[PDB]
Amino acid sequence: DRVETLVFDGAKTEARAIASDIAGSVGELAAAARTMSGVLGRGHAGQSTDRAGAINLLKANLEQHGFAFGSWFAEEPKAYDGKDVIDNTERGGNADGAFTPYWSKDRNGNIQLSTFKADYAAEWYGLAAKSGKGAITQPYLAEGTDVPTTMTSIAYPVMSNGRMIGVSGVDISLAALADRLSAVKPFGSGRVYLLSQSGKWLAAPIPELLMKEYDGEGVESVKDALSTGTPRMIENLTYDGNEPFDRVVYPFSLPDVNAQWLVLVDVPR
Numbered sequence: 001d002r003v004e005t006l007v008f009d010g011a012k013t014e015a016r017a018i019a020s021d022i023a024g025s026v027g028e029l030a031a032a033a034r035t036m037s038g039v040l041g042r043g044h045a046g047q048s049t050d051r052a053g054a055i056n057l058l059k060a061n062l063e064q065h066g067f068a069f070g071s072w073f074a075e076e077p078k079a080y081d082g083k084d085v086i087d088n089t090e091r092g093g094n095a096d097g098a099f100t101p102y103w104s105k106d107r108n109g110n111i112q113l114s115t116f117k118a119d120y121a122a123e124w125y126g127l128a129a130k131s132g133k134g135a136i137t138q139p140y141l142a143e144g145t146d147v148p149t150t151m152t153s154i155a156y157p158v159m160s161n162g163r164m165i166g167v168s169g170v171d172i173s174l175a176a177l178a179d180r181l182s183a184v185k186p187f188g189s190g191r192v193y194l195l196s197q198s199g200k201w202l203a204a205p206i207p208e209l210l211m212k213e214y215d216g217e218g219v220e221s222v223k224d225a226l227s228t229g230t231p232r233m234i235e236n237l238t239y240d241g242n243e244p245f246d247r248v249v250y251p252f253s254l255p256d257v258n259a260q261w262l263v264l265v266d267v268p269r
């Protein structure tokens with residue numbers, strides 16, 4: 001159809017715009033995470049930074065990049081400095097007794113020093129540690145944040161003389177993503193959303209959908225778009241009665257973290 005084709009093109013053109021903005025923001029944070037992983041690693045190799053200073057330096061990633069919700073480092077057990085660590089949040093000690101510093105934002109938009117559990121099998125640690133390369137997580141509810149907040153994490157292995165000593169990473173709150181999708185505008189009576197590597201909701205119509213897997217109308221096309229990496233269009237779906245619209249899905253590779261996301265662009269009839 002010449003109408004549906006034009007809707008498909010216009011939505012594609014705008015999804016292309018949205019994807020390069022998200023991909024750019026992501027790639028820039030990934031670079032800041034990888035840099036931090038380096039200075040934490042080299043600072044360990046040459047005893048240029050103690051455990052106290054590692055916390056000092058870790059705050060730089062939030063002061064310089066507003067799009068990062070938090071900056072953290074989970075240390076392989078006893079790896080950093082081997083000192084006793086039980087419960088000293090000002091020195092990166094969790095209840096488990098492990099070096100886990102965490103700078104994050106609180107409810108009022110200020111920076112606080114938190115601490116988290118060393119869940120080595122968790123995506124934010126396992127992915128980067130098993131591949132040896134930078135990685136990005138499926139959306140998950142963060143623990144060490146002041147207020148519970150749903151975020152995705154870009155994590156990199158921290159190396160010290162050819163042996164890894166832990167994982168450092170940066171966070172993108174699911175709200176920050178939602179904000180960007182309104183800073184660069186929707187279709188005008190058009191809404192844009194965002195799916196994760198596996199089709200989980202990163203930016204959704206209602207917040208109840210976040211972190212859940214897509215199973216609305218046109219689900220198979222989402223799975224097929226995710227495979228081919230090419231765009232699909234779900235025709236005529238209804239948030240019921242009121243105005244029906246088309247759902248265009250637009251995969252796009254994220255720069256350094258070995259993953260792709262879907263832009264969803266909703267255009268009403």
Ligand SMILES: C[N+]1(C)CCC[C@H]1C(=O)O
Nearest residue numbers: 072102116142143144145
């Ligand atoms: C500290 N983090 C933001 C990063 C790793 C775990 C996560 C958290 O649970 O808070």
